[PDB]
Design an enzyme around this catalytic site. Structure first.
Site, PDB file in Angstrom:
ATOM      1  N   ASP A  52      -2.718  -2.526   4.410  1.00 34.79           N
ATOM      2  CA  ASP A  52      -4.006  -3.201   4.561  1.00 34.79           C
ATOM      3  C   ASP A  52      -3.953  -4.658   4.128  1.00 34.79           C
ATOM      4  OD1 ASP A  52      -3.795  -2.397   1.897  1.00 34.79           O
ATOM      5  OD2 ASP A  52      -5.733  -1.359   1.859  1.00 34.79           O
ATOM      6  N   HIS A  53      -2.835  -5.097   3.560  1.00 35.26           N
ATOM      7  CA  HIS A  53      -2.560  -6.510   3.371  1.00 35.26           C
ATOM      8  C   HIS A  53      -1.492  -6.922   4.363  1.00 35.26           C
ATOM      9  CE1 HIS A  53      -4.127  -6.884  -0.952  1.00 35.26           C
ATOM     10  NE2 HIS A  53      -4.239  -5.599  -0.663  1.00 35.26           N
TER      11      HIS A  53
ATOM     12  N   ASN B  31      -5.905 -10.226  -6.610  1.00 40.98           N
ATOM     13  CA  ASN B  31      -7.137  -9.440  -6.638  1.00 40.98           C
ATOM     14  C   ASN B  31      -8.366 -10.299  -6.903  1.00 40.98           C
ATOM     15  OD1 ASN B  31      -7.445  -6.749  -5.799  1.00 40.98           O
ATOM     16  ND2 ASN B  31      -5.986  -6.108  -7.385  1.00 40.98           N
TER      17      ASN B  31
ATOM     18  N   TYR C 212       0.819  -7.761  -9.531  1.00 45.15           N
ATOM     19  CA  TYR C 212      -0.267  -6.980  -8.951  1.00 45.15           C
ATOM     20  C   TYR C 212      -1.361  -6.943 -10.019  1.00 45.15           C
ATOM     21  CZ  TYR C 212      -3.040  -3.053  -7.404  1.00 45.15           C
ATOM     22  OH  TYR C 212      -4.096  -2.242  -7.041  1.00 45.15           O
TER      23      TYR C 212
ATOM     24  N   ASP D 210       0.826  -1.208   0.000  1.00 45.72           N
ATOM     25  CA  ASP D 210       0.000   0.000   0.000  1.00 45.72           C
ATOM     26  C   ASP D 210       0.861   1.259   0.000  1.00 45.72           C
ATOM     27  OD1 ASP D 210      -2.353   1.507  -0.060  1.00 45.72           O
ATOM     28  OD2 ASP D 210      -2.348   1.724   2.125  1.00 45.72           O
TER      29      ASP D 210
ATOM     30  N   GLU E 125       1.948  -2.856  -5.232  1.00 47.34           N
ATOM     31  CA  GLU E 125       1.446  -1.506  -4.966  1.00 47.34           C
ATOM     32  C   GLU E 125       2.520  -0.648  -4.314  1.00 47.34           C
ATOM     33  OE1 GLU E 125      -2.672  -0.331  -4.393  1.00 47.34           O
ATOM     34  OE2 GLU E 125      -3.138  -2.404  -3.875  1.00 47.34           O
TER      35      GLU E 125
ATOM     36  N   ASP F 296      -0.529 -10.172  -5.339  1.00 51.04           N
ATOM     37  CA  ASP F 296      -1.910  -9.793  -5.088  1.00 51.04           C
ATOM     38  C   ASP F 296      -2.663 -10.073  -6.379  1.00 51.04           C
ATOM     39  OD1 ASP F 296      -4.339  -8.539  -4.748  1.00 51.04           O
ATOM     40  OD2 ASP F 296      -3.499  -6.623  -4.125  1.00 51.04           O
TER      41      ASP F 296
END
Length: 282
Positions: free
Chosen positions: A272-273, A176, A135, A35, A61, A174
């Site tokens: 947040d991950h 998603n 990502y 993040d 990210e 990630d």
């Protein structure tokens, strides 16, 4: 309206550092959607990395231009080979791969210009395997990017099938999507939200089938609920473990005998991950 979820406990099992054959792990890979690289460094993410001591660190990210890397990355001597891909733009997406040993070759993107402009993929080839960190594009608010995500999914799966035809493949990052209902706390409320649409879940199943790849965590822990890697910063979600498993290590089937463990570092703060860590006996 009233939220239905209180806390659900999840304690990641102790690290299994021996393969089913008895072979000690020789390779430790950690993947983390940070993040924002600078924000994460200020939140002490590098201190955590130093304690975890992975052989390879994959970051997603980064949100950081390749020409604006924080100097604090120079103080990572055990991860001295560092590669970055950021949008061709600034301040969004972006991935990094930092390695103790020097890869035989590093590449960026998936060989498809439409999909290679947003700093999403690094490929690092080693002697015995190829590592990809990714990502994956989010399907977007109101699903406005779902059509593009489906095109991405197909191009990415075709690219990975090609890599795995030549060398055993580890994909991390990630992705998603929460593949199945066990992969998020609130499946019923999220079937029309990015990360749990039928299209994205099917795309993940298509990825596993076509390459083919195995989901390392779910292979080891097929029935384990409440194991997530992402929680919204809002709605007190992390404290309640209202999360999603969006971060994976996917492995060529030939690597399953080398698989020691696939961890979810639930307590590691700074994004947040949370980080995920793979142990392989290569």
């Amino acid at each position: 309206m009233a939220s239905g979820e209180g806390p659900a406990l999840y304690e990641d099992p102790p690290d299994q550092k021996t393969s089913p054959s008895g072979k000690p792990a020789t390779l430790k890979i950690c993947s983390w959607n940070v993040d924002g690289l600078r924000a994460w460094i200020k939140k002490k993410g590098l201190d955590w990395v130093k304690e975890e001591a992975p052989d390879i660190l994959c970051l997603q990210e980064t949100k950081c231009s390749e020409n604006k890397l924080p100097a604090e990355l120079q103080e990572l001597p055990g991860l001295s080979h560092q590669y970055w891909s950021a949008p061709s733009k600034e301040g969004y997406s972006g991935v990094g791969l930092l390695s103790r040993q020097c890869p035989l070759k590093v590449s960026y993107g998936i060989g498809d210009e439409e999909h290679d402009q947003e700093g999403r993929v690094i490929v690092a080839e080693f002697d015995s395997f190829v590592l990809v960190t990714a990502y994956v594009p989010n399907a977007g608010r109101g699903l406005v990017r779902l059509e593009y995500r489906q095109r991405w999914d197909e191009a990415f799966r075709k690219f990975l099938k090609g890599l795995a035809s030549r060398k055993p493949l580890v994909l991390c990052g990630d992705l998603n999507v929460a593949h199945e209902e066990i992969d998020l706390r609130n499946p019923k409320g999220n079937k029309k939200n990015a990360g749990f649409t039928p299209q994205e879940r099917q795309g993940f199943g298509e990825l596993l089938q076509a390459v083919p790849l195995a989901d390392s965590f779910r292979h080891l822990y097929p029935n384990t609920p409440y194991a997530y890697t992402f929680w919204t910063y809002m709605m007190n979600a992390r404290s309640k473990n209202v999360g999603w498993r969006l971060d994976y290590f996917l492995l060529s089937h030939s690597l399953l005998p080398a698989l020691c463990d696939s961890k979810i570092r639930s307590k590691a703060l700074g994004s947040d991950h949370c980080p995920i860590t793979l142990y392989l006996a290569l």
